[PDB]
């Protein structure tokens, strides 16, 4: 679209938001991380949306850069869908986080928060666990809706790219 | 600046991400909230950065809208500075959160996480508390650096506004 200056800023901002959400989602939280963290999606996917900011400098590289960014957006939207299900229906992919992050949270998990001792269902300890699980669900669904936002804007470009080529 | 199309997108994106960080920071986390939540800064401040997107439609209202958005950016940067100190040096402003948010976290706090029982310093319960405190520090410092990002871009406009007027 002609708004490609206005759109290239949007891609860059979506990149920085992913990087910020990634660093936030990399804050120590226990044994298992979301797949998004261990795939490092917000880092490499974030900077890829910065790099598609190349189109602000309005060659076959750019066709590759835009197409490469579309794969990142799609894969990120899939990864964030997976982690929300990973959190709320079944911890089906037990991504063992990162040991330099587990170092600060070595005895702790958020993929289960039911206490083995039912007296503790009332306990502050249990409310803390469900708080972090709710924050991770929040961060992932925020990352998803911005990952979906990338798909819309990259579609509005690459749909024109290959019809121009 | 002439890039005001590219800049108006940046303002809108900074608005949406403040709203997302606000809703994330409004996820139930205990008795006390950050001041940013109880001031509702990410909601009203976020939509104000959407509204300064009026300059994408390139009158004295716009001079007021830009100047009003600059107050929001400055006040947000101050508020997020305050909450980081509120979390990490002294809980000096005990913003009693919101009762519809406390309903899910009625017995719990993150402005202190030292257990009254020193045996519990090792406990998972204590690691959960410090995890949420670290996440809130993370969310606030992410919100701060984007609140600071607004000041830079609004300065690059209102510095021209009043010299044009």
């Amino acid at each position, epitope marked *: 679209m002609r708004e490609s200056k206005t759109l290239g800023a949007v891609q860059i901002m979506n990149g920085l938001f992913h990087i910020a959400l990634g660093g936030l989602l990399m804050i120590p939280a226990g*044994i298992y991380a979301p797949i998004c963290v261990t795939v490092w999606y917000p880092l490499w996917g974030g900077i890829m949306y910065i790099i598609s900011g190349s189109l602000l400098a309005a060659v076959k590289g750019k066709m590759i850069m835009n197409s490469l960014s579309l794969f990142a957006a799609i894969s990120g939207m899939i990864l964030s869908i997976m982690d929300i299900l990973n959190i709320k229906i079944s911890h089906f992919l037990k991504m063992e986080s990162l040991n330099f992050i587990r170092a600060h949270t*070595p005895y702790i998990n958020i993929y*289960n928060c039911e206490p*083995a*001792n*039912p*007296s503790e*269902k009332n306990s502050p300890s249990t409310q803390y666990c469900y708080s972090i699980q709710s924050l991770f669900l929040g961060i992932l669904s925020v990352m998803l809706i911005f990952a979906f936002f990338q798909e819309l804007v990259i579609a509005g470009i690459v749909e024109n790219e290959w019809k121009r080529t | 600046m002439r890039e005001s199309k590219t800049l108006g997108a940046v303002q809108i994106m900074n608005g949406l991400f403040h709203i997302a960080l606000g809703g994330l920071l409004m996820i139930p986390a205990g008795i006390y909230a950050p001041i940013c939540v109880t001031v509702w800064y990410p909601l009203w401040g976020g939509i104000m950065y959407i509204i300064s997107g009026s300059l994408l439609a390139a009158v004295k209202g716009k001079m007021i809208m830009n100047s009003l958005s600059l107050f929001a950016a400055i006040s947000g940067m101050i508020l997020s500075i305050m909450d980081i100190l509120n979390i990490k040096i002294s809980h000096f402003l005990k913003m009693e959160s919101l009762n519809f948010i406390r309903a899910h976290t009625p017995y719990i706090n993150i402005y202190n996480c030292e257990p009254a029982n020193p045996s519990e310093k090792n*406990s*998972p319960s204590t690691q959960y508390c410090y995890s949420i405190q670290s996440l809130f520090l993370g969310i606030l410092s992410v919100m701060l650096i984007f609140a600071f990002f607004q000041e830079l871009v609004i300065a690059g406009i209102v510095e021209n506004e009043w010299k044009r007027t």
Partner: antibody
Amino acid sequence: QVQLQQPGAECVKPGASVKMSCKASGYTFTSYNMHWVKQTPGRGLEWIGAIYPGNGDTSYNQKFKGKATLTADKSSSTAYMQLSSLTSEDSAVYYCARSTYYGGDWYFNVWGAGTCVTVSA
Amino acid sequence: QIVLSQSPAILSASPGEKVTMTCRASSSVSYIHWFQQKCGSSPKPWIYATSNLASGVPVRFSGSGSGTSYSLTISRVECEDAATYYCQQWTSNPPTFGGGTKLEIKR
């Protein structure tokens, strides 16, 4: 003093169900979690679940969440476990155990003698 | 859900020899508890909170470790020590037991 009494053996039919008791004595029954642990020579010790008799809250191991049904009577001071839909693989020794919080962790500090269950036609 | 791996599965030592048996957790746990079981007995609590001997456990025993690697060690074994020892963790729901180490004594 503190003691958990269990019926020593139950012999039951496939598809049937069995209820086994755990009579607490010598302590405030309602103030502690009562846990149930399966033992089989081929699988070791598997935690089944727990009940807090104070309110009545239960938690279950996911691999047992439809096999066991934990209940407790405040008055007789007795915990119960019902096992549904019994199969050969339910043949085991079942211990009740009382968990205290002690030394900075939960602790199975007293155990029942165990109930031998075998499921056979 | 944490797997506790005990080594060796079978251990033997002559009376007065020193032994160590190890429990390795598939993830780091706050503490490991050890239980002694003899044939036809229920498990007895033996060590709690990684290192505290249960009531009446001989100071002959001690327990140590941290993170993912724990051990129980007996300075000088005796015939009353012949048993199966299970490690156990509370750090995750469900609590889980190790496969046991069977100690038998080379009298």
